[PDB]
Every structure is written in structure tokens, then in C-alpha cells.
Design a protein around this ligand. Structure first.
Ligand SMILES: *C(=O)N1C[C@H](NOS(=O)(=O)O)CC[C@H]1C(N)=O
Ligand SMILES: NC(=O)[C@@H]1CC[C@@H]2CN1C(=O)N2OS(=O)(=O)O
Length: 251
């Protein structure tokens, strides 16, 4: 079942690991086991769960749902509008997801994380890593108190998308909808979300791509993670590595 594998050829000399799990036939493919078991901040990958929280609590209702943009100026052009759930997810729009999560009481979030077994489920630093100076552009899921391992990410993904949580199927399908990506291969369906952060304590990136793939009957849940010391390594870069792994070993 648990197969140690070597995907270093796809990592282009970047430090990281990967885990792919097929729950039907229990095949667990692990590259860099120590890293895959290490908890780190989820960064923007948490938007997968925060979207479901918002849908479940009725803060948002569909992929068109808006959060009432108030005119605040942001450097990313596409944050400066009353964007829908679908575009806020794809743009990783921090103000949208901060306003969303701050409409939900802390006990509801704690119980949902507990139910999902979401890493350390530690939301004690609700406001986030305020020492970085970024103020309200912060939260417990952004290089702060909440931490989860790549293995636990995969377990959470599988629980959600195999229908094993109490989240509504309608809401699960919205997530599938907005997480779908185009890999120029119609023979596989890939879904995911990136994450980018810098671990200031250890001087290492937290660069993520987490999601799942479907091809000809089988579904693999996956998490690819870099902990490189090179600050240029981002979520988008690790998503490229993930796509190379998928095209090479999961075709
Ligand atoms: C989430 O990881 N973040 C928000 C934004 N999106 O990054 S992503 O492209 O990897 O999704 C960039 C910064 C980052 C953050 N912690 O602010
Ligand atoms: N971010 C993506 O979705 C990636 C990046 C570029 C395209 C779409 N995609 C691929 O897999 N690509 O590469 S391509 O297959 O070689 O054309």
C-alpha cells in the first residue's frame, strides 16, 4: 500500500515532498516521508476549507456570491471590485476571505476543524501573524497558529470529496467547480489550490499545491509541498512541479 517513491526528477532541484493517495485501492505514494508528516501553515490552501465553512454557515451561497467590496485600494487590480466567490478563490483575494471568516463565530470554526481533523486545529491566533506589519491582511491560516501536514491535507481532501463529511453535496460541488484547473490534458481532471508563505522562524518557504486528480475511474488525493530556503519558490512554482509529476507518473 504505502510506497516510498522518488519524484526528485520533477522537482528541478527544489527541496520538497509529495504524497498521492488512492482510497479505493489504498495505494499511498510518498516522496520525502519526513516532510510529508511535518505540520506547516496551510497558507492560501486553507481557502478550500474556508469556502466550505462560509457556504455551510450561509455567509455565501454559490460561486457567484459576493462579500460587499467597500472601495479599498489594493495593488492587485482584480481585488478592487465586488468579485464573486469563483474569482476570489482563483485570485486568492485576502480581503474577501478575511471578511468571510470574520462573520463566523470562533466555536463553529473550531468544531469544523476538529471534525475535519485539520492539523493542529489551532485557531488561537485568530488575527494572524501581526508582527509582519500587514494588519488586517492576516489570519490564523497565514503563517500563524494553524498548521497541517501534507499527509493530513490529503486525508482532509479525501474526507471532503468522497462525501464523508456533513458538508452539503451542493457545496462540495461548488468547490470542485472553482478548484478545477486546465492542464492541457483532457484525459485527466485536476483540481487544486496553491499556497505561498515564508516560515520566518526557520527561514524556509511554505509553498503548496493541494488537491485531487481523476483519470479513468481512479481518484488520487494529493499534496505537494516545498520547504526550500530559496524565497523565490512559490505556490505557483510547486503547482508546476505537481503538474509535471502528474503527467509523468499518473497518466
Ligand atoms: C496565500 O497563500 N496567499 C495569498 C496569495 N495567494 O498565494 S498563492 O498564489 O500561493 O495562492 C499570495 C500570498 C499568500 C499569503 N500568505 O498572503
Ligand atoms: N498552470 C497550468 O494550468 C499549467 C501551465 C501551462 C499549461 C496549462 N498548464 C499546463 O500543464 N500547461 O502546460 S502544457 O501542457 O505544456 O501546455
Amino acid at each position: 500500500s504505502v510506497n516510498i517513491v522518488d519524484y526528485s526528477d520533477c522537482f528541478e532541484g527544489i527541496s520538497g515532498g509529495a504524497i498521492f493517495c488512492n482510497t479505493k485501492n489504498k495505494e499511498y505514494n510518498i516522496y520525502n516521508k519526513e516532510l510529508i508528516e511535518t505540520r506547516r501553515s496551510p497558507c492560501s490552501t486553507f481557502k478550500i476549507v474556508s469556502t466550505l465553512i462560509g457556504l455551510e454557515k450561509g455567509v455565501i451561497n454559490s460561486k457567484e456570491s459576493v462579500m460587499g467590496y467597500d472601495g479599498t485600494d489594493y495593488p492587485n487590480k482584480n481585488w478592487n471590485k465586488n468579485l464573486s466567490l469563483e474569482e476570489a478563490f482563483k485570485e486568492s483575494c485576502v480581503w474577501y476571505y478575511k471578511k468571510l471568516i470574520n462573520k463566523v463565530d470562533a466555536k463553529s470554526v473550531q468544531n469544523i476543524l476538529d471534525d475535519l481533523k485539520y492539523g493542529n486545529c489551532d485557531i488561537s491566533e485568530w488575527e494572524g501573524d501581526l508582527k509582519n506589519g500587514k494588519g488586517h491582511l492576516n489570519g490564523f491560516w497565514l503563517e500563524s497558529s494553524l498548521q497541517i501536514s501534507p499527509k493530513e491535507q490529503v486525508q482532509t481532501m479525501a474526507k471532503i470529496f468522497e462525501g464523508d463529511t456533513n458538508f452539503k453535496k451542493e457545496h462540495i460541488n461548488i468547490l470542485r467547480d472553482i478548484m478545477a484547473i486546465d492542464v492541457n490534458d483532457a484525459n485527466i481532471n485536476v483540481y487544486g489550490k496553491t499556497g505561498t508563505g515564508f516560515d520566518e522562524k526557520n527561514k524556509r518557504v511554505d509553498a503548496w499545491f493541494v488537491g485531487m486528480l481523476e483519470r479513468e475511474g481512479d481518484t488520487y488525493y494529493f499534496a505537494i509541498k516545498s520547504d526550500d530556503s530559496n524565497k523565490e519558490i512559490t505556490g505557483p512554482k510547486v503547482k508546476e512541479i505537481a503538474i509535471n509529476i502528474i503527467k509523468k507518473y499518473y497518466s
